[PDB]
């Protein structure tokens, strides 16, 4: 029950949970481009010149 002292420890192993692999996909997923505005189909002159 004396509990004598011991020598100096050489190395200290650190145990830790691993990096989060297979979380990010190898291609990227962007928000798609909002489309450029279209001229709508079915546009015709509705105004006739009077008389």
């Amino acid at each position: 029950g004396g509990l004598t002292c011991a020598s100096a420890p050489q190395g200290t192993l650190r145990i830790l949970e691993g990096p989060q692999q297979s979380l990010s996909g190898s291609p990227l997923q962007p928000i798609p481009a909002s489309p450029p505005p279209q001229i709508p189909p079915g546009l015709r002159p509705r105004f006739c010149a009077f008389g």
Partner: protein, 105 residues
Amino acid sequence: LPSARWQYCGQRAVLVQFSNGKLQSPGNMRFTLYENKDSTNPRKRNQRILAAETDRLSYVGNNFGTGALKCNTLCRHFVGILNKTSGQMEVYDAELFNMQPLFSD
């Protein structure tokens, strides 16, 4: 690539911090440890007081009071041996103490 073998046996390997410096000179220093009474609660496995008397001063180390370090609750401590003959890192359980010297009241 050095390797070993994990073998967990289970006993506590007490580890000591000092509040004043490294030890660096082992000599004529007593070591006794003062666990709690009641084993019905888990206080027998948690409450412990370490005494390290020298002829000059004497050092007290707790596990429960204001001054106990938070490296044994938020983290677990082990002690390896690495018997390189059989090639096994057989690993015990540890606990870290931080001793304050005792002066007055």
